[PDB]
Design a binder for this molecule. Sequence first.
Ligand SMILES: N[C@@H](CCC(=O)N[C@@H](CS)C(=O)NCC(=O)O)C(=O)O
Length: 294
Amino acid sequence: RVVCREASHAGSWYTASGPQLNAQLEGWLSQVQSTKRPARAIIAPHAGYTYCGSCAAHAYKQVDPSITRRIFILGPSHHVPLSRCALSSVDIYRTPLYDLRIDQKIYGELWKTGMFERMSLQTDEDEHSIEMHLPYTAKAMESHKDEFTIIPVLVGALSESKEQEFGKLFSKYLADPSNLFVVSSDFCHWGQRFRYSYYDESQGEIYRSIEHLDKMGMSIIEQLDPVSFSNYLKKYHNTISGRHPIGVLLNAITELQKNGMNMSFSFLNYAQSSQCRNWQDSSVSYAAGALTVH
Ligand SMILES: N[C@@H](CCC(=O)N[C@@H](CS)C(=O)NCC(=O)O)C(=O)O
């Protein structure tokens, strides 16, 4: 049995040198003023750090490392035909900063729901959408580096009913101030290379239409409304890569509202990998945001 998941995208999606990566993350985090501490959930991108690291800092700066003790990371599956969610087979997730330990107690509880499959080590290491949050998490939590655990969850192509069921399942954990939910997603992938060319001419340039479409989705997320978000996906089919983890989060939020809790979500930074101006251009969008529970 292999006990460690190697940092299989280090050096290609982010800097492999621990000390240099540490300084790069520190630099991006220093440019952000914390406004939403202590975040109970964040939405953050999963592209290479050269493209999205500055944006992701706006989410990670909202984590209060003196409060958060367990960090769920829900990332969408890119390679495998997964219809449910999957849990890791290893005990430790490596990063160039320091290695992260999976919460064995919660992993046992989750497994006993019967709702999860077990992803192989090969599946685990092939996916990047969880790994891209490990260095940032390690950096955000370094002042308490030996006092927190992670709960990695691979999120497949969930049906609406599975988004509802997993949302209700995770809601009991979302209600605990010691827990943090990292919801991994990029926003619009625009261009012929993505077979996506939706364009609202009332917005002007293509990149402004992309910004408007993304921000329609971001505003719906801020309305805490999973049905509205599903309807928006059905209407425009925006290529939001973590739409299923987001659907899980929104259903968890509505479950907590039914239990009498009150919540607020705010997006804090929006960016595009480039600015599309003609039909042959392509770009990927990034958005960072935080959920506050009082
Ligand atoms: N170096 C990595 C990452 C490259 C990368 O991050 N590309 C951007 C687009 S310029 C991106 O957004 N990737 C994640 C996504 O498409 O959602 C690779 O070769 O795939």
